[PDB]
Amino acid sequence: QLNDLRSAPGARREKHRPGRGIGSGLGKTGGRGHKGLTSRSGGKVAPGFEGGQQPLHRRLPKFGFVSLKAMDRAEVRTSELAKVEGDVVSLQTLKDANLINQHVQRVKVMLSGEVGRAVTLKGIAATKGARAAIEAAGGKFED
Amino acid sequence: QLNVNGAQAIEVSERTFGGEFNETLVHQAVVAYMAGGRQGSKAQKTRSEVSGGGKKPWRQKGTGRARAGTIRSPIWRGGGTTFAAKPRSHEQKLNKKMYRAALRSILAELVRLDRLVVVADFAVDAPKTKGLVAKLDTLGLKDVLIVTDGVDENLYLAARNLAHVDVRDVQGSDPVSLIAYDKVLVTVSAVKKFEELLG
Amino acid sequence: PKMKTKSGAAKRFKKTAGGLKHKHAFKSHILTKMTTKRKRQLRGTSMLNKSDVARVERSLRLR
Amino acid sequence: ARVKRGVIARRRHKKILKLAKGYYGARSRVFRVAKQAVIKAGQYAYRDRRQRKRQFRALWIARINAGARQNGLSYSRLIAGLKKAAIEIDRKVLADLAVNEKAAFTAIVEKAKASLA
RNA sequence: UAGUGGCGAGCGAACGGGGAUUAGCCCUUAAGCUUCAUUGAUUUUAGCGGAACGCUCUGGAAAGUGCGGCCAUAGUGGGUGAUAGCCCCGUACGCGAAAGGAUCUUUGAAGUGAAAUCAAGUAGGACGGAGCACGAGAAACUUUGUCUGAACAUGGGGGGACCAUCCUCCAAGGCUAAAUACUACUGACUGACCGAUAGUGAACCAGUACCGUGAGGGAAAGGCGAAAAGAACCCCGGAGAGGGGAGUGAAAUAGAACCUGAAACCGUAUGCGUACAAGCAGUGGGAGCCUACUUGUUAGGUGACUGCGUACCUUUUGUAUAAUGGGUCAGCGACUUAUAUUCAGUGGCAAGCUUAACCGUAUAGGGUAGGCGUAGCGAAAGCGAGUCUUAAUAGGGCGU
């Protein structure tokens, strides 16, 4: 019945309107207060502005550069090696599934749980702990 | 199970039919469908499109009247509306998994409340409205929703002029009409169609 | 996206998963005054204070 | 959906102008004066529910006092005379016996004198 | 986001992915595009036919109350004396052109594209400026105002100062549909749009009246009834204006300045109180009189007398204030929307959740590109349940 159903208690609220009456609580000012900047149309203090003291983001030094070398990096957890088909974890095989982005060339494998099955990594270079898991739990690490 | 009128059970999947009736979900699914059909065509007019009203009607001081700046202001008589609204869309995003759980929740209470009549096959022969009226007199129904696998050209030309009888498809049904009409009439071709569509 | 960050605070504040890093200050261009106990206690990379989190996380558009 | 507010404003004006009838001049017929004289006439009706209880208590006392001097006491020695014993009769139903039932009042006064207080 | 930027306010790419659309031809002379001659298709400027109902009540008048029946590829259209699938016009459907109008296409013709001939005052260079996301900056590249100047495919110029090695293209001559942007004007629809202070400035003879030397500004203005049946005739009046009858009508307190007809404002009757009494004009007690009563330990209206009592809003440490504002009434008149993001409430699936454009028999379904997660530390390379600093594997920071 469309004459019956309604939502859960608390799921909908009713958008309090400032500027109506005196019993509603928000009458005659709307929760703003009295005279000043944050009481007027467009009383927006600029984000980061302090009042005239030298702000934080103009007192501290600039401290680095950005590596364009690591715009091509990704990494795969050991637990996600069971999420591919064919048991040949190539470079394009991880792009066949949605486990990795496009335009990604160099991939590692680190230790983040149990592997799951018997695969053959090639084209990708695992860490010290991941290589001690795959070569021990029935896999093979070739190129 | 779903007792077809030719007296044979069918043993449907018990995840679609016979489920818990969450109605916070169904209320949200019928609001998003019913609001998504509204075309939004308003146009009021702000103080910048009302024709004229460029210059001050008198000086700043010395006149006695209150400080006015233009004629086409929201306080004045011929002025413009102060929060005039351009046309816009009304469309909520409902998830694909969330649209389907409202279907598996309203297709359970139609089974409990016995609004659902499953038939062997429903087929008319010539497009003529008085032939279909006599066909629905066999089942004893009135103001019914006809859900079938494919809307036949003979069946679609009938029940356009007919008053309270509507004909749909499984991929043309919606969470309003399954709640709206008095009785829902499905065929055995269509109850299998809700298996791969819902679960 | 209609939310542009500030370019200065993206160079003064790198973000890790334990807050916001920032380099210390006062260490440039007059250094023969200061004491070695004071120089090496400004060499590290600290993390931001709780009074300053909700100020910077509005300058950086994280709100 | 434009709403015009000319039919629910009128019902609230007639509800004010009904409480404010019987008043002098423009207090009973124009609205921007008759709203002040309904709020003010509601504050007075709140204060004077307390002052009602003070204007009869000051009237009961001044009738016992006149009635008990005619028999040979004061008011203040009568109340100490009744509370040597426990006659336990309040001011509302002594100032009734002072006017109407005058012979029963004299039979009370003699017992306060017999109470020697 | 990388960059850019008094490195301030800010401005902001590309590479790579996903879609819509699908043609490349010539300087040996081409597709293509024009303009006529042509043969068919497609609609377009007017139309035509177009299903099915009776009795009975109340009413001024039946579409309504009743009791039945029929039509349907036509059942929520309009309007007829009140609410009509079946009374009228229409609708679903079917057919329609002397003659023009185009749109695709027929196969011819006249052209044209078209500059002649693979590109010289051209590339590059030097000061001065612009455009590149790029405010002389290690400033590449495209442009042109002044001044100059080459190699001739064993050449050339690109790959963000510069140089060697590799890769990739042929500059100084041209032509090209489609996806695309827009609406002064048309037609068909549709509305959680307006309903005469709204909606166009304009429902009314509106860019009019009026205001200006001019450019220019710019209003107010809807409604009798189903049908004029719009008042023959009589009496007062200036032979008028206006009334009093009489007649029409369901109804003239529907009579043309006409549906309903409120508030401020002004009156006329009836009841009760006031001409020896001082003030935000009310409130608590209260005599008497009046009306209806159910005859008054009821109701209504006046209120002699008497106690307490210096309006409302806004600004302020503070207002009866000789501080602000308001002549009263009736209409309108002030926290909204869109796109991004954070926190709570309530929901879906869950180490996984979800798609944007765009397709679609179009609120379904497809589309997982992309995003946020499942692991951090470091300025970085890098290494990873650890990592950075350090001679230290010593401590310590951050993390599980």
Ligand SMILES: [Mg+2]
């Ligand atoms: Mg408050």
Ligand SMILES: [Mg+2]
């Ligand atoms: Mg303030």
Ligand SMILES: [Mg+2]
């Ligand atoms: Mg104020």
Ligand SMILES: [Mg+2]
């Ligand atoms: Mg202040």
Ligand SMILES: [Mg+2]
């Ligand atoms: Mg992906």
Ligand SMILES: [Mg+2]
């Ligand atoms: Mg303007």
Ligand SMILES: [Mg+2]
């Ligand atoms: Mg101007």
Ligand SMILES: [Mg+2]
């Ligand atoms: Mg307007």
Ligand SMILES: [Mg+2]
């Ligand atoms: Mg979808």
Ligand SMILES: [Mg+2]
């Ligand atoms: Mg230094």
Ligand SMILES: [Mg+2]
């Ligand atoms: Mg006809």
Ligand SMILES: [Mg+2]
């Ligand atoms: Mg007809």
Ligand SMILES: [Mg+2]
């Ligand atoms: Mg109709």
Ligand SMILES: [Mg+2]
């Ligand atoms: Mg009528």
Ligand SMILES: [Mg+2]
């Ligand atoms: Mg009709």
Ligand SMILES: [Mg+2]
């Ligand atoms: Mg008839």
